[PDB]
Design a binder for this molecule. Structure first.
Ligand SMILES: [Ca+2]
Ligand SMILES: [Ca+2]
Ligand SMILES: [Cl-]
Lengths: 8, 124
């Protein structure tokens, strides 16, 4: 259930 | 023929995962990263990304370069070793000047995921 949430 | 998420999770579960994540977060796309050749590039333990739709491919490529080359060195710290990486979507080079939504609309897998692969070589 794990996700990486990239940002700017 | 290298080990992927399709071998880990059934088609029906993957369809369910991506459907509900897309209903819950319609402005992000589900991406899975996969190692595409045998070399000194490490196998990343975390490979699922929820990428903002308006993020540029070139930007996501920069982020992905760092992730693949970083490993945990305790708490508050990450070890970065510089290595050359080539990235691929459905066997082709992701176009730098596009949105990540475009990649999703063009190359999305039937199971709902955008599959992307990294290699130490520029070929496939
Ligand atoms: Ca793999
Ligand atoms: Ca499935
Ligand atoms: Cl490994």
């Amino acid at each position: 259930n794990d996700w990486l949430l990239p940002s700017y | 023929g290298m080990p992927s998420l399709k071998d880990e999770v059934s088609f029906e579960n993957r369809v369910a995962e991506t459907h509900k994540i897309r209903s819950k977060y319609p402005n992000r796309i589900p991406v899975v990263i996969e190692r595409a050749n045998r070399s000194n590039l490490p196998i990343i333990e975390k490979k699922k990304f929820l990428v903002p739709m308006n993020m540029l491919v070139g930007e996501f490529k920069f982020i992905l370069h760092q992730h693949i080359n970083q490993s945990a060195y305790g708490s508050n710290m990450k070890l970065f070793r510089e290595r050359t990486i080539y990235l691929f979507v459905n066997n082709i080079v992701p176009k730098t000047g596009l949105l990540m939504q475009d990649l999703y609309e063009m190359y999305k897998d039937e199971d709902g995921y955008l599959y992307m692969e990294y290699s130490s070589e520029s070929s496939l």
